[PDB]
Design a protein around this nucleic acid. Structure first.
Ligand SMILES: [Mg+2]
Ligand SMILES: [Mg+2]
Ligand SMILES: [Mg+2]
Ligand SMILES: [Mg+2]
Ligand SMILES: [Mg+2]
Ligand SMILES: [Mg+2]
Ligand SMILES: [Mg+2]
Ligand SMILES: [Mg+2]
Ligand SMILES: [Mg+2]
Ligand SMILES: [Mg+2]
Ligand SMILES: [Mg+2]
Ligand SMILES: [Mg+2]
Ligand SMILES: [Mg+2]
Ligand SMILES: [Mg+2]
Ligand SMILES: [Mg+2]
Ligand SMILES: [Mg+2]
Ligand SMILES: [Mg+2]
Ligand SMILES: [Mg+2]
Ligand SMILES: [Mg+2]
Ligand SMILES: [Mg+2]
Ligand SMILES: [Mg+2]
Ligand SMILES: [Mg+2]
Ligand SMILES: [Mg+2]
Ligand SMILES: [Mg+2]
Ligand SMILES: [Mg+2]
Ligand SMILES: [Mg+2]
Ligand SMILES: [Mg+2]
Ligand SMILES: [Zn+2]
Lengths: 56, 238
RNA sequence: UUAUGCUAUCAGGUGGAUGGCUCGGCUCAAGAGCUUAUGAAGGACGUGCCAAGCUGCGAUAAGCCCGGGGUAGGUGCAUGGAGCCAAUGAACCCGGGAUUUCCGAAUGGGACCUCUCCGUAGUGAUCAUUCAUGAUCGGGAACGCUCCGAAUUGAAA
RNA sequence: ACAAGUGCGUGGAGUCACCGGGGUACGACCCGAAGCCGGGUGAUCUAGGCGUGGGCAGGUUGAAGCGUGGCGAAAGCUACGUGGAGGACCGUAAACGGUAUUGAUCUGCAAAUCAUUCGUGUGACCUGCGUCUCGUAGUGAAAUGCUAAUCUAACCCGGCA
RNA sequence: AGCUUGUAGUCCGUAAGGGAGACAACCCAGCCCGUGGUUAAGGUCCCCAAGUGUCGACUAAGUGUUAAUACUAAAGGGCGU
RNA sequence: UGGGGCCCCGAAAAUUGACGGGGCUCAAGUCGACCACCGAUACCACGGAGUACCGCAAGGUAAUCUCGUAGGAAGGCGUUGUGUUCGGGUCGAAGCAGGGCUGUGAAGUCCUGUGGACCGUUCACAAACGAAAAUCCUGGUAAUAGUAGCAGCAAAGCAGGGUGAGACUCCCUGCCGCCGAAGGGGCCAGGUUUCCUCGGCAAUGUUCGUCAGCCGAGGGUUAGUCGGUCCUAAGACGUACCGUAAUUCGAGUACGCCGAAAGGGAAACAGGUUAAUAUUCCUGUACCAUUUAGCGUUUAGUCUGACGUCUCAGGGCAAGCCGAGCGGCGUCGUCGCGCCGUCUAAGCAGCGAACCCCGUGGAGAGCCGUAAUGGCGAGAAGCGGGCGAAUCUGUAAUGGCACAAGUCGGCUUCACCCCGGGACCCGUGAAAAGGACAGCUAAAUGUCCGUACCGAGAACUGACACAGGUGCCCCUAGCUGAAAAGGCUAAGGCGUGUCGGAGUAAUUCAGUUAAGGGAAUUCGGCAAAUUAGCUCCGUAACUUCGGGAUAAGGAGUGCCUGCUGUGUAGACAGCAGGUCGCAGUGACCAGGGGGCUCUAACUGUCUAAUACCAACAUAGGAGAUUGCAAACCCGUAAGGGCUAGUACAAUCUCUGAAUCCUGCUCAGUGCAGGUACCUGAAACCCCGGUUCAACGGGAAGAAGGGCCUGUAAACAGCGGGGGUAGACCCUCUUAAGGUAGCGUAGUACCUUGUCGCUUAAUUGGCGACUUGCAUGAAUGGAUCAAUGAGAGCCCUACUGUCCCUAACUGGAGUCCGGUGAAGCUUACAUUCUAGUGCACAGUCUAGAGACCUCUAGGGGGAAGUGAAGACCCCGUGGAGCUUUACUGCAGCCUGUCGUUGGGUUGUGACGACCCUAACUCUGAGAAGAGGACCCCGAUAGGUGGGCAGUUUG
RNA sequence: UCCUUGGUGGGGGCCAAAAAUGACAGAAAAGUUACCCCGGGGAUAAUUGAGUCGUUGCCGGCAAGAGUACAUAUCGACCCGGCAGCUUGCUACCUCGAUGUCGGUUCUUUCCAUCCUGGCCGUGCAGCAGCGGCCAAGGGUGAGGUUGUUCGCCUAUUAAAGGAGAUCGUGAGCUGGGUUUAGACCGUCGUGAGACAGGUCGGUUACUAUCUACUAGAGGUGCCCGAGGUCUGCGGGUAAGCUGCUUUUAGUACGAGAGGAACCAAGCAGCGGCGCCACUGGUGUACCGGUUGUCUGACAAGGCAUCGCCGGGCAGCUACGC
């Protein structure tokens, strides 16, 4: 058995579900937090200054 | 940062090093009794405690509080358990050590009054009441230390049940594996010389050896205090 | 009639450069500058006679009503068939309203379930108070204030 | 600083622009690595712990215990039957693993698979689903192995031109 | 040692054209374009333009037909001539 | 005899070859001279260009100017646009292909063709301003090439008739086949319409195709009873408290809430119906829950839900099988057999086997039992009674069956259900909802979600219609057979593990057979071959007494006739006679065996994707820390892991079963303790200084260090030289000189050490000796039965491994029809030799060969392709790791200040003592135990590779 | 001189002297990497190649002498001069955007400095058998045990069982035994990570052939009255054979004896070459027979299980035959 195509047929399950707040498939099913908008962790939307570049 | 030791992983509290707390029957402690109070109870059954690999007695008291108790040797079903200072010095009874005659055996000793029992709890261990004084009382513990305890520290008379458990050799890695399933301990354990230098202080090299003295100081930091920690001496008895 | 070929040109194919155009973009300047529990932004689903995407709208669903402008056509990007709307002044633009499913600060409990359970019909949490009522919660391109806070790199180490 | 010698300066020409050359710092003619640091992502793969389930064709061997009978004065010795123990044995193209052919294939069926030959196959077993442990951190019966085809320090974006 | 490290001059690097079979730096030559002429180096039996050239000898081994040279064998011997 | 010229011997090299080749002999060689000619861009001359300087300009001079890399300087050409001048264009602008002319050239202008709307120029000015190249980037497109692939693991199709314009490929029929314990049936996750009907074939399908999981259109999923829903588990999430500079961040606590489509669980079955739905819709017959009403009650605390692994008895049943009758089909050369069917659910009513309980009973020179263990005056057997299963019987009885029979007996029954026993555990094998004990009758209500289809060699995942994985997850019939193995057949699914024809080489992938020899092959028996099932006889060394063991070495085996024994029975075991063959486990299936060493005890684990090992782990042994407010560890903190724990424990290490053992060294380093003396920071105190301090000293002195002691199953170490016939006086002794053992080793340089067995011969194997470059005792030593896909050697058996290859089979290849890529490539290229050239040339130089094109072949060459070398060096490039490198930072130890109070003595503020009242811990609290200590904030010193950044020229 | 002014303590400064960086035109500074990574280098090494030849292999001159005598049958000191480039060196010219690195195997070729076969000369050659030298590259030069080996030893044959070159010929041919990765053990070093030109066990061999070369098979044109047939021979190739054993010569020549040849002739054998299938052997999935298990209802006839397995075998092909 290998790490390539042999063990990639075990991908019959999910770790991210479609989040309510943003409709993106980023809601982790174990931590209960969307990794795109942060629903289930915070009221505000997660946005960081490293998501774009320094404006200079 | 060379990788943290097994002790640091255990102290962090990961699932590999956590005790399976749901497997155990009940926390063992003496029943809560107010000062100048007592309660009677009878044994309704001898069960098996996975936390200690020794029997524990299910005792039903007079106020109806079904409480698991640590089983001294010889305790049976239908026996009456008594607590308090007025309780007779009898095997299985919970009394202060200040009333126990010197030379008797006690177990599940309390560090402080109304403690619930800390010392002398393994399968078969016992303590000896050495001396009585007004503020103190000496008990010879299973290690050998003459610990000085308060005269009001309760204890159940007799040696702890399940004596002789370590007499049988393990004889097979599966038997110890099955014991360690219900334990918090990690099984099996890799020797530190077989580790790489990133993992342990003693790892690495072209051949299996520590390269440094295995007796480590008491003032060592965490992640370095391995081997023989703060040894008074080493080796077999010459 | 010398095939397979070679070189130069010509005609055609494939191809989409050059040229021309352009309702887009970028940069600079000048104004104006908050919104949200009276439920936002954002999202899911629905929504068209024939309608898949986008856009708009929300079971009144590419829409409804009222005051002003405009006036002969209208029926989105996207002048197809058949109908409909409009001189009771539409379409379109400005202003004021109505409707505005579910989630979302999401707020009666619950989310791998954008739905589900209780219905005794919902003010969840933290607060102020006369305990009538009220505040905060989220979003906003950057700017503003407070606090926490690296390394690459330069010194030719 | 006393002295005498000499240094620098002194008999009025600079300043501000346009077009240029060059030096210096900033991404500084353009492209080119391993890396270092901040914040987030990942245990659908794989490693380990836990909860709850499912599995292991068909045979073999025959531990303790028990019954009956022999041998002895006793102590004890002993045969057969029964018994169903074991990280026991053989064994499947059940399952798991992956020895040798250094065969096939190597712009493959396949970014490691196929054939024959093999190891375990009642247990330190295999495995479904659930849940947990993670980046100087986790896990590791320890190879620097594994942590989503990536590991002597992952991946994504940012410091970064 | 076609090695390494200096010194004087001249070269290649940065050097055409002509000639050594080809030759970075060996000889003529330092070179704007076209034409005519004559020479340099070197060659004149053919390949190849011009000598089967002249005089006096040597070599008999295909020796040789190889200025410089990283491209060319010595010591020794020969009543070979 | 000496001095000379040329030549000769000395004189041998590897593809055929080099005076440049032909060839040349009073020369076409050598020497001394000579003549004439050839031959450069030089020199001369003529005409022209540019440059340098001078001249106002015309122009003047240059034998004394004209080559050119890095580079400096000057002058121009071109693209796009701005200001400004002058303009061109549907009587045809830009751009594009070719061509003429000008210019040294950059480039400009003009002409021919096409085109359908803009485009230049003077003088100045700006720039996202000029490409041939960066393994440059994006796009398009070649050569390879009509080539490889469309083959290997399941070699599958043929005849007739259709449909169709078109048929190997689609449909029907027959024949021949594949799977048949999976390629069939059911469904989880996942997919998401792939499901079903109709119409098409531009793309998809490894060919075509009228076919299709494709394209287009339409349709399809119906629940009180199946699941979700409800319950709780491992474990998440929320609010509050608390922490944090702060949070969306963090452990714990309290209250909640979620967490399983395979755990628990209230209840439905049979038949019909559609193209696709069916325990859901329809027919029949039922059942469950909640609420409302009528009739009365609690027993209310228990039981059930509810439990591991192994083994086994008894009972039932699906499936299976046999005999009789009955109804159809097949066969029918002869026979009378073979196959199919002969059906019947839940619900309702009834009986109830074991176990358990109750009333009697009276059992010992012992009796009653089970498969087995067992039971008994603490009361067995026996007799009654109660509680009590699966299934069975009766009804449901009319449903479907061609309304064709439809009725009966027997055997067996798993792996399914009920019930009971036993054994094991240093494993003890879940909880909660729900359910039972007071219910009976009536009526109404039972919302929401899923329901199609695939579930995999084509519906999932791996880029794919992927030989993998997910799933072999749960079921699977007849014969053989121990069997679910393998072979042959049902049912069921398929001829789609989606290219065909053809039979003609070499070569190749996988097989069959091979005389005589039998490992002579090879690094090595790698590969292949041998043996193989069952019964019986028999079985060695050695051993931990368990084993080795299927050791080894042997015999039998079919079929037919007739019987016996055990069992209730299925079935099992055995015997006599006859008989066929080369062969009776006739195919399939199925160990070759043994001996001596090394190593590890063993089962296990391991570098997924080159290492299945002797490495890791293991039980066993030993050591160390810690009395629990602990040791060890995490966190900044709040608070935590170990821990629902307590020395028979947890944590930290070394060694690695058992057997015999484990010697000396504490000098170095480490650790622990003692601390008399020395050193030792800050605060406090005293002196000097300061109109005050900074500052300089003194006193005292914590931890730490020096110092002394213990410690080696702590890190570690355990020696040479001279003699004596080599057993002694001494050495070399900065602690000690290696004991038991083992020894050319897995360690041994010399080395292929020396001797014996093994072989004709052995750098080998084993045994012995061993002066050991450089063995040795938990850095564990020696040794070891058993085990081992481990590493060597030997014997037997076997064989195409070989002598030495041959023939045959299937798939490729060759040829043909269809489909159809990729990789190398500056250009040219029909080469061969030698030389030269950066010293390894198809392209240069000189020769020699060579007509071109195509097919097949295997690979000589293209220093063939893959690829910015991984070996070596360099880089004031990195990373990881180490440490008595440099500099630091956590952790830990300790003095002082604060927290921090009250009384007593001994001193001049210091040390001790006592108290409770802050504070800490425990408990829900009463209260209990410590207590001004500890913890905590700050500061001073130490230890400190635990961690960080760097350096190591 | 010290930040408004004056002072006091204490700092700052000018000039000069001392304290040191020895890597001495001045960093406060240890290792390891085979777990390694990255940027480059033929600016620089292992590698092949080229140059050179100390060393290695092979020789020559002069002959000092030994050889009973006698330098030169044979050996050839000292000293001197060479060739080859086949051993090890030296060097750094080519290659680090790789020329796949030892040994074996397969196949082809080349040099002669010849081991055997062929021809001679000398001898201190009686014969047999040696010894030394010259010519000669047509053929031959093998099978085995250890070792990864090259080399070397050993075994029995043999005419002999030569050496060397071809990128230490030959990995788009093979093998993978050794060396040169990642794992592990032993010993020795190092406090340690780790290292050893020490040993041991284990350890991935990628490619569809464009051009050229060769091997064979065809299609064209060129030459030519048009076609056919039979020949010639410019040329190309060969090993088409090479070598032993026995008999005869002859137990003769020679020799005191033992021992013991050659010329001619014959047969057979080893290897090589070419060809063939009467005989023998192999195969022979055409075919025939026996038989196991199972299916088609039984017999008969058939399917499948490697041709199910087993026995036999014609033709064909082929060697082990001729
Ligand atoms: Mg910014
Ligand atoms: Mg360390
Ligand atoms: Mg710097
Ligand atoms: Mg002075
Ligand atoms: Mg028995
Ligand atoms: Mg097995
Ligand atoms: Mg990975
Ligand atoms: Mg970056
Ligand atoms: Mg010169
Ligand atoms: Mg020059
Ligand atoms: Mg020249
Ligand atoms: Mg220049
Ligand atoms: Mg270009
Ligand atoms: Mg074919
Ligand atoms: Mg079959
Ligand atoms: Mg097609
Ligand atoms: Mg739930
Ligand atoms: Mg082992
Ligand atoms: Mg081990
Ligand atoms: Mg010792
Ligand atoms: Mg051998
Ligand atoms: Mg490079
Ligand atoms: Mg430098
Ligand atoms: Mg460090
Ligand atoms: Mg730095
Ligand atoms: Mg390592
Ligand atoms: Mg080759
Ligand atoms: Zn989201």
């Amino acid at each position: 058995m290998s790490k390539g195509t042999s063990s990639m047929g075990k991908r019959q399950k999910r770790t991210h579900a479609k989040c309510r707040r943003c409709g993106s498939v980023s809601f982790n099913v174990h931590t209960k937090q969307c990794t795109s908008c942060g629903f289930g962790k915070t009221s505000r939307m997660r946005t960081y200054k490293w998501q774009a570049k320094c404006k200079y | 940062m060379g990788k943290r030791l097994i002790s640091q992983n255990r102290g962090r509290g990961t699932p590999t090093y956590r005790a399976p707390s749901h497997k155990y029957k009940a926390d063992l402690r003496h029943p809560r009794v107010d000062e100048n109070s007592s309660l009677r109870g009878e044994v309704v059954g001898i069960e098996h405690d996975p936390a200690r690999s020794a029997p524990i007695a299910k005792v039903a008291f007079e106020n109806g509080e079904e409480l698991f108790l640590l089983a001294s040797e010889g305790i049976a079903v239908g026996n009456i358990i008594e607590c308090g200072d007025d309780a007779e010095v009898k095997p299985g009874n919970i009394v202060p050590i200040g009333n126990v005659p010197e030379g008797f055996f006690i177990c599940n000793v309390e560090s402080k009054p109304n403690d619930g029992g800390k010392f002398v709890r393994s399968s078969g261990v016992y303590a000896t009441v050495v001396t009585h004084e007004a503020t103190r009382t000496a008990v010879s513990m299973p290690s050998g230390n003459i610990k000085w305890l308060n005269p009001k520290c309760r204890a159940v008379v007799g040696i702890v049940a399940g004596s002789g458990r370590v007499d049988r050799p393990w004889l097979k890695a599966g038997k110890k594996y099955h014991k360690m399933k219900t334990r918090a301990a990690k099984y099996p354990r890799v020797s530190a010389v077989a580790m790489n230098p990133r993992d342990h202080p003693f790892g690495g090299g072209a051949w299996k050896h520590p390269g440094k003295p295995t007796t480590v100081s008491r003032n060592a930091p965490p992640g370095r205090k391995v081997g023989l920690i703060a040894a008074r001496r080493t080796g077999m008895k010459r």
